[PDB]
Design an enzyme around this catalytic site. Sequence first.
Site, PDB file in Angstrom:
ATOM      1  N   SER A 137       0.864  -1.057   0.107  1.00 20.63           N
ATOM      2  CA  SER A 137       0.043  -0.024   0.066  1.00 20.63           C
ATOM      3  C   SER A 137       0.756   1.290  -0.068  1.00 20.63           C
ATOM      4  CB  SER A 137      -0.873   0.060   1.195  1.00 20.63           C
ATOM      5  OG  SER A 137      -2.071  -0.914   1.028  1.00 20.63           O
TER       6      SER A 137
ATOM      7  N   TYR B 163       1.852   2.920  -3.319  1.00 18.11           N
ATOM      8  CA  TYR B 163       0.704   3.859  -3.917  1.00 18.11           C
ATOM      9  C   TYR B 163       0.364   5.386  -3.343  1.00 18.11           C
ATOM     10  CZ  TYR B 163      -0.726  -0.589  -6.077  1.00 18.11           C
ATOM     11  OH  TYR B 163      -0.675  -1.973  -6.757  1.00 18.11           O
TER      12      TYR B 163
ATOM     13  N   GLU C  86      -3.982  -9.147  -2.682  1.00 18.62           N
ATOM     14  CA  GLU C  86      -4.780  -8.131  -3.210  1.00 18.62           C
ATOM     15  C   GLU C  86      -6.160  -8.542  -3.001  1.00 18.62           C
ATOM     16  OE1 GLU C  86      -4.078  -6.175  -7.057  1.00 18.62           O
ATOM     17  OE2 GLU C  86      -2.050  -6.510  -6.247  1.00 18.62           O
TER      18      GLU C  86
END
Length: 348
Positions: A243, A246, A327
């Site tokens: 994460s 991003y 994911e």
Amino acid sequence: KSKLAKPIQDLIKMIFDVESMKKAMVEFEIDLQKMPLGKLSKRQIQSAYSILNEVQQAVSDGGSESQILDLSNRFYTLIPHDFGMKKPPLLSNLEYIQAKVQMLDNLLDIEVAYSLLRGGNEDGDKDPIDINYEKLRTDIKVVDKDSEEAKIIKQYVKNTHAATHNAYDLKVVEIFRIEREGESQRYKPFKQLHNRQLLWHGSRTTNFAGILSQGLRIAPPEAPVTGYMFGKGIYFADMVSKSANYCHTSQADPIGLILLGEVALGNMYELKNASHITKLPKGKHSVKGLGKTAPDPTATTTLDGVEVPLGNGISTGINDTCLLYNEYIVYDVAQVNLKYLLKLKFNY
């Protein structure tokens, strides 16, 4: 002055920072001279999505080169780009199209932030910080560093920070407890599901006014199903590392924001490689792209009856998978209830 704690004030100043919004647009190669922050509109973005949808299809079905050139001209005319001394690349390559689809996902949230920022700030009895906070319609609280929530959350950050992501350290500067207006209400039906987990969701700091005000959402109808790995859903991770990428931070801008959300996974449709899922098979509630690494399931704990995969990164049995990391994808906006917002500091 502001009645909010200092940490929340700095948080508001950060998510509503205009320079950050411009920096983001400059990085997406948008021409700020022809396309300033104030020109951005939802309708413009939706039209842009549709153009990307048609071009994606032309490239795939082998449409006329003339059609692809035409669609590229219409895209660049709608969203002015600045390529400097170089020629503008045609939307004739699938990767470049996806990159453009992602740009629009970000512009959607930037548009919300700016519109909120230029909206109702006329009141004088309130400090500007306080007015913008209220615009978020989200109750924000600072989580005590010595509490159990904090300890558990900090353990989760530390342990799910993989070995291949040791290109940086991560420091938890602040943890906020968030509660978006009416989100608990729309999520209620999903408390009936099992396999509810506390997962990570990373995003650019420039997306948070939109995330906090509109909640996490699904790409609009116009966006191509192909512009996303597992179709149009909300994506989460169990490793902060995955994460944390991003977040789009660097040595020049080390502070990032990251969300911990409760997501009603239920029965997961397990996949080893990408699939443009339109529909979920009966009986399935979410998608789980399998990865080579994941938290040690023996160390998993619970927090308010929610599973927290805070275990150390340990290779999963499977190896014929393409994902390095797991994911999780839900296709219903009501399957997630945001709980915490962390202010992270990256040390490279």
